[PDB]
Chain length 198, copies 4
């Protein structure tokens, strides 16, 4: 249906001291809400274009759709990938899947950390499942909608946009990327992997 | 396992005169095979990097992975989306789904056509299924890996890279985009749509 | 010689309250300095590649060079486009050129503002001289190095990367885009325009 | 005034057999012409936008402006960089400048070639003059307006868009990149170089 702003499963300051409540608030109620509106409007402008049978602005409408919808999609998984009861390491299948796919959980951690801290502009680090080769792969996302193939199922995202850590970490993006591991909700990622493999 | 070049379901000149056998031979045996090799190589360079604990070239590795795997994925669906006993219009769920999401089939076709012919460089037009919103949406893909969100399930793709139409239609790509409709394998799209909703 | 981090022609807090001294400090000593080190590194990397006759990482070296040199080029102009004893309005040559190119300073200001506040990720708003058509145009720059032609002479830049106003304005980027006009150094732009027309 | 399609300084088939007369007519008369009209169209919509005080499509107008203006700029220099009486090596200042900046003319050829043949989608190889560092550098241009800094003076360009060699070289882009050195108009590049360092 219409896109909507999801409700957080924890209080804004439940991730402190890893992630400030101040950022979580602005991030959620300001930033994320902006993409949900942008996604809904994009879908509405396209409805109109088809009705009036005028696609002179197709490029703009398609960019707005992809940008906002991807913005919305990314943030939705981001809030679920975070937990106050998080951290530690993944267990079972997922733990086994990550070890076979990246050699070790530490090697996986390293690659994810490097993809997240070397983005040139806004972006993300993403762990996803490739349906084609049936493999767990890490992708370096540019902005919200670029640098990955179609049909990839996202499992774990790390928001590398400046607004995700600036207020707190300032320019030191690697301290924020290291902190992230302390609030990862592996139960949600395990659930995602199980759904992707089935 | 390794990414592999899928075999075609028809002889090279099965789609004539809409699509030349000459283009299909080169397209398949040269272009597509090059992406498969690149995808496998990218995955191999990442294995090496993790083994050496050296991610100085993570940006390059991640770009080579996304570019080639996306090229491989895009072309694997392309070949299945085409059929000499194709053309017509979709039927069943797909027909109703398309009609109930774009107004009509013709309104869908007009938008797809507009997205396919206004790309500013290499790209594709794509019919995808959004899992968060549960909507059928059209996206305008730049290159192979850009301008769309994560989790989108591709249903129907239209390759708008110059090599896909140049030998036959030269600079008149809108003529190639029109001919495309005569060879679409709706049985394949219907099949992908059923799996995406199930 | 190597690229260098230029000195500010004013104290870090000279722009308050329009732009905080804390942002100016970080911006200058941390961000800008990073691009200078990155362009020098890219340049050296290419020297070594040429000496070793090995261009296996040509894509990465060209990307690192473009991104960091453009980051360095944009910030260098940005520092010079600001002044504590500036803002308000341009005169003589450019004042006439701007009204002729955009109808009025106010119409010019509105499009500049619109270009600055609608970027989809990190970017800039830029006023440049097109040598080919001998026209004054405004460009919407993506990141540091994208969305503009070769040969464009930059005259006035507005940094829209989140790190440019986040600490102070938070998510309200239009309030920062508006406060920018109070510190523009018209003399510097006026000077860049005569040289471009020369 | 308006942007115009420049006339070629030679007959369409004057570059044979290095570059077909067929590709030259299509390239010039069809492709280049579209970029000229697209740039003039973009400039007009922006005039209209300013008149109606409506910048709701500013992202689209700025992208169409950049893409087409860049398309037009790149091809104008392309026609001038080619010559039937071309080839050989650069002499005088330029020769010494290249050797000084790249080690040798052959080390320059190798880098330029690699940059040209590794583009992931549409792009160009370009030799430019960096006004800031006063350095001669090679950039790997994506599409027509991406992957290079502002203020860069283009000297020599190599069109790597598929429509530039497909009809004749098919998928073998490296054979076309090699053939290129046979029609390079060093008299033009030397002239551009003198103007840039002036
Ligand atoms: Fe975010
Ligand atoms: Fe293709
Ligand atoms: Fe900045
Ligand atoms: Fe071209």
């Amino acid at each position: 249906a219409e896109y909507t702003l999801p409700d957080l499963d924890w209080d804004y300051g439940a991730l402190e001291p890893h992630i400030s409540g101040q950022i979580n608030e602005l991030h959620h109620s300001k930033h994320h809400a902006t993409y949900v509106k942008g996604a809904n409007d994009a879908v509405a402008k396209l409805e109109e274009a088809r009705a009036k049978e005028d696609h002179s602005a197709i490029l703009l409408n398609e960019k707005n759709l992809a940008f906002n919808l991807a913005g919305h999609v990314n943030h939705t998984i981001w809030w679920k990938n975070l937990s106050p009861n998080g951290g530690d390491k993944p267990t079972g299948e997922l733990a086994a899947a990550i070890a076979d796919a990246f050699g070790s959980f530490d090697k996986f951690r390293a690659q994810f950390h490097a993809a997240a801290t070397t983005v040139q502009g806004s972006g993300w680090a993403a762990l996803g499942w490739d349906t084609l080769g049936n493999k767990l792969l890490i992708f370096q996302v540019y902005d919200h909608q670029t640098n990955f193939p179609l049909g990839i199922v996202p499992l774990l995202l790390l928001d590398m946009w400046e607004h995700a850590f600036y207020l707190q970490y300032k320019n030191v993006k690697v301290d924020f990327a290291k902190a992230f591991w302390n609030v990862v909700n592996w139960a949600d990622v395990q659930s995602r992997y199980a759904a992707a493999t089935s």
